[PDB]
Amino acid sequence: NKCDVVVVGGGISGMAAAKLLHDSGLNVVVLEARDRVGGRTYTLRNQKVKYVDLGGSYVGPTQNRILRLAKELGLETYKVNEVERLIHHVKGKSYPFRGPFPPVWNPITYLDHNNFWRTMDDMGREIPSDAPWKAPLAEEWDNMTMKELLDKLCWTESAKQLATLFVNLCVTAETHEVSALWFLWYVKQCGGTTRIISTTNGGQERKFVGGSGQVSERIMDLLGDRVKLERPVIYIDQTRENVLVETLNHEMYEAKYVISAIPPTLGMKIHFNPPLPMMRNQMITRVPLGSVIKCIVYYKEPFWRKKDYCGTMIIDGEEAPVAYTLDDTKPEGNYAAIMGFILAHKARKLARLTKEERLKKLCELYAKVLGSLEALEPVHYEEKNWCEEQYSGGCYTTYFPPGILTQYGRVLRQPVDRIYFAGTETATHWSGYMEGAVEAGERAAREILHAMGKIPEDEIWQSEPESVDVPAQPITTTFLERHLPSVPGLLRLIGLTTI
């Protein structure tokens, strides 16, 4: 089977690459391991739920590429519910609030909290989005975990605990598992702490009507039979004039170039000839994905709205199986549902239970957090544990442990002869997200267009017009937020005065 480009992987990244290549007149083939396209996006359809996203789902302002792609495919978005109050549940009690952060009243504690978020963003501006290893203190920040950085920065337990929950929620890993340099890069390349955490004006603002899985499905429709399902790639041979790509079900494909659009560590599932160079060879053993179970509990009505709760809950505590939820009710107001994430070590701990026992524990938690016995009367339940996926490795994305990003980072998207690398991990804006997948898939496709002499070099990286449907408000601070001292800053001032 002969073509111009073989794309390995039919998730969003590979489908976007294939689409770009196909629209340019090339012959592409997509080799997908599963019986479906979409990868870490998956939309379940049945009569009880109508449709529901079990993997990637949320899109928001500044994610202009996935928005343009989805629009061009005939899809619409709608807004996640944030009309009523959010809830911060901490030490067994719920405190309703509005805004990006639960209010903090103790003035010392307020100083510590304000300095925490501020400093994450301050450190982040030192870090180039396209080369995090070029930060001036890249080595010092990469040689520490997030846990060590939090221990040094937070002068109250309250700030340390909120921060810990933010890390677990952002990257589905524990603070002691991840590099400080990598996590700080990861937040900055999504636009910063406010953009990444928020619903209104942030990452979680919207969902696609009908599910995100339609993105990959509609591209598959346009490509017709160029997409080969149940073709896991086992072997890539670059020793001859054309590249040979072999599949597990005994098929051979021959091409000029290959795009690898799979998570970096799943490159281990492929035997290479000749062997990868040393740096990539080791890099793909060093970059695990996080751990998460996405759970959706359905109810007769969205009862929390009547208590003036929008359904967003930040839930702190070792005993809480779920640390964050959002209202997952359909835009029409039916199929009332709460979506929650079970994160990092709790995904591993609670996977031992049955589905019915996990549903029990979530309802009892929601009943307590919402102060509502109706939470004990679910009508349906769907869930997916991504830790068990042979062809994903986890979700949402790949994290870097201490020391890895500075030593091996520069190789993530470095071509290996005629293999180019897409996949959301190799993006520079919303890496980890469906937005990053589109950016990486189209950039890798244009690297190949450039190698064939079809476009000039300055067209490999291409900026994206802002969505007219999902405008981005800028992220602003107040004068007090900018200039209030940190806790040790204030202690320093007290020392000074006392002389």
Ligand X SMILES: *[C]C1=C([C])[C]=C2C(=[C]1)N([C][C]([O])[C]([O])[C]([O])[C]OP([O])(=O)OP([O])(=O)O[C][C]1O[C](N3[C]=NC4=C3N=[C]N=C4[N])[C]([O])[C]1[O])C1=NC(=O)[N]C(=O)C1=N2/[C]=[C]/[C][N][C]1[C][C]C2=C1[C]=[C][C]=[C]2
Ligand Y SMILES: c1ccc2oc(-c3ncc[nH]3)cc2c1
Question: Of ligand C15, ligand Y, its own copies, none, which one does residue 166 interact with (CB within 5 to 8 Å by kind)?
Answer: ligand Y
Burial profile 413-445: b = 16 or more Cβ within 10 angstroms, e = fewer: beebebbbbbbbbbbbbbbbbbbbbbbbbbbbb
* 44 bridge partner residues: 52
Using rule CB under 6 A, residue 314 touches ligand Y: yes
Q: Find the binder of ligand X among 3, 18, 43, 56 (CB under 6 A).
A: 56
| Of residues 338 and 487, the one with the C-beta less far from ligand X | 338
The yes or no reply on residue 391 touching ligand X (CB under 6 A) is yes
Q: Quick check: 489 binds ligand C15 (CB under 6 A)?
A: no
Closest among 403, 432, 411 to 178, alpha carbons compared: 403
DSSP string for 201-245: TSTTSEEETT-THHHHHHHHHHHGGGEESS--EEEEE-SSSSEEE
Nearer to ligand C15, 155 or 299 (CB): 155
Binding mask 131-160 for ligand C15 (x = CB under 6 A): --------------------xx--x-----
**Could you report how far apart the first and last alpha carbons of the chain are, in Å?**
82
Residue 118: other Cβ atoms inside 10 A: 16
Find which of ligand C15, its own copies, ligand X, none residue 152 binds, CB within 5 to 8 Å per kind.
ligand C15
Determine the interface stretch with ligand Y among 137-145, 184-192, 194-202, 278-286 (rule: CB under 6 A): 194-202
320-349 residues in contact with ligand Y (CB under 6 A) are: 324
383 close to 223: Cβ distance less than 8 angstroms: no
Q: Using CB distances below 5 to 8 A depending on partner kind, what does residue 272 bind out of ligand Y, ligand C15, its own copies, none?
A: its own copies
On whether the CB atoms of residues 425 and 398 are closer than 8 A, the answer is: yes
Determine, following the binding rule CB under 6 A, whether residue 34 of this chain makes contact with ligand X. Answer: yes
162 part of the interface to ligand Y, by CB under 6 A = yes
Interatomic CA distance for residues 328 and 71, integer angstroms = 22
Question: Counting contacts by CB under 6 A, is residue 488 touching ligand C15?
Answer: yes
186 Rama sector, left if φ>0, alpha if ψ -120 to 50, beta otherwise: alpha
CB of 18 to its own copies, least distance (A): 23
CA distance 28 to 35: 19
Token pair for 154 = 């937070």
Minimum gap (Å) between residue 204 Cβ and ligand Y: 7
* 19 vs 34, beta carbon nearer its own copies: 34
Report the site for ligand Y in 82-111 (rule: CB under 6 A): 86, 100-101
Rounded CA separation 336/446 (Å): 43
**C-beta closer to ligand Y: residue 165 or 255:** 165
Q: What is the size of the binding site for ligand Y (CB under 6 A)?
A: 13
Contacts of 150-153 with C-beta under 8 Å, sequence gap 24+, read 150/175, 153/115, 153/116, 153/119
Task: List contacts with its own copies (CB under 8 A).
Answer: 143-145, 147-148, 174, 176-177, 232, 234-235, 248, 250, 265-266, 268-269, 271-272, 275-279, 281-282, 285-289, 291, 345, 348, 351, 385, 387-390, 393-394, 401-404, 407
Residues at the contact surface with ligand C15, assessed by CB under 6 A: 151-152, 155, 488
